[PDB]
Amino acid sequence: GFGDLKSPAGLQVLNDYLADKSYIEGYVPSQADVAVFEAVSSPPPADLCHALRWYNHIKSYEKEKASLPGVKKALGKYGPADVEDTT
Amino acid sequence: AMAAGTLYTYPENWRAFKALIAAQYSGAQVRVLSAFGQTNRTPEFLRKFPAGKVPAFEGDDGFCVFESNAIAYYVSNEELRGSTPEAAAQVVQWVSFADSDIVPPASTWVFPTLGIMHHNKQATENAKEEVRRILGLLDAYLKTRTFLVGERVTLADITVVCTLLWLYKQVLEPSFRQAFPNTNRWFLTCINQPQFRAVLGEVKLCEKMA
């Protein structure tokens, strides 16, 4: 997980995670993108370049969100592995 | 609707790749004839394509077009071409940038590793700096963008990727490309799109400079 996606430090983890990525999972948009997106809720600060870039990209997909492949997971399952993880 | 015809080229031509990747997006049914060779000099070929260049395209309706960017445009769709005049101007921008700014110094640097050229340690090193400048420009542009035009792949990304293909494969070793993380993220994303992948195959970034 990224932690609290409505806090700065969480957005910093989301940003660092997106430095070498265009999507949350893989190389095409998925439901993984939609869930983190809805959790961020509002455009990250521009200084979090990779986070904001990814935000504007997924936002361009909002009109067709449910059509995106994959299935929603718990926010903790996205991004960096949590060392202490259930399941 | 979508174009249908024959694409004459030599095998694994990065210039033909532009039109083959675009066709994957559009649904254009493009046949490749490669195994040919010096057939570009046959009289018939010359009529159809006086330039004698490849790649060259002959539609099933007799329509012929003989330059790489033009074949890719033709077998593309509105989305790749640019749906608005702004988007379409931006496509032309990156295509022309690829042709004028990337192709020559990439040629000067790469051909020697390939042996196609003659190595002039000054020219080759200046070409390096040129490429570095290009990578840098792409990197700063892509800091806020996933793709070059709009929020979808266009002829811009397709053209630039194929143009940078040989650099990334043979010469842009990790130590060299680390100064441009956004261009590399963009490059990896692009070549991993299903459409790119069906043409390029798995693309291995240069581990060690050639």
- Tell me the chain A residues in contact with residue B145 when contact means C-beta distances shorter than 8 Å: 53
Tokens of B148: 């070059």
What is the fold, at CATH topology level, of the domain defined by B77-210? Glutathione S-transferase Yfyf (Class Pi); Chain A, domain 2 (1.20.1050)
Q: Count the Cβ atoms, other than its own, within 10 Å of residue A71.
A: 8
For chain A, the residue count is: 87
In terms of Cα–Cα distance, which of B54, B57, B70 is closest to B159?
A: B70
Test mutation, A33, A53, A61, chain B, max B CBs within 10 A: A53
The reply to whether residue B151 touches residue A57, judged by beta carbons under 8 angstroms, is yes
Q: Where are the CATH 1.20.1050.10 domain residues in chain B?
A: 77-210
**Residue range B1-76, CATH number:** 3.40.30.10
**Residues A9, A42: contact at Cβ < 8 Å?**
no
Tokens of B132: 């570095």
Q: Are strands B29-33 and B4-8 parallel, antiparallel or unpaired?
A: parallel
The reply to whether residue B144 touches residue A60, judged by beta carbons under 8 angstroms, is no
Resolution (A): 2.1
Query: Å from A84 to nearest chain B CA?
Result: 29
Query: Å from A48 to nearest chain B CA?
Result: 10
Q: Give the integer Cα–Cα distance in Å for B54 and B39.
A: 10
Structural element, H or E, at residue B30? strand B29-33
The reply to whether residue B151 touches residue A22, judged by beta carbons under 8 angstroms, is no
SS3 A49: helix
- Structural method: X-ray
Test mutation, B146, B153, B180, B195, chain A, max A CBs within 10 A: B146
- Tell me the chain B residues in contact with residue A21 when contact means C-beta distances shorter than 8 Å: 185
Q: Where are the CATH 3.40.30.10 domain residues in chain B?
A: 1-76
- Tell me the chain A residues in contact with residue B143 when contact means C-beta distances shorter than 8 Å: 49, 53
When CB atoms are compared, the residue of A21, A46, A57 closest to B185 is A21
Q: Give the integer Cα–Cα distance in Å for B29 and B37.
A: 22
- Identify the sign of the CA torsion B19, B145, A68, A33: positive
Q: Give the integer Cα–Cα distance in Å for B7 and B59.
A: 9
Structural element, H or E, at residue B7? strand B4-8
Q: Give the integer Cα–Cα distance in Å for A72 and A61.
A: 16
Beta bridge partners of A58: none
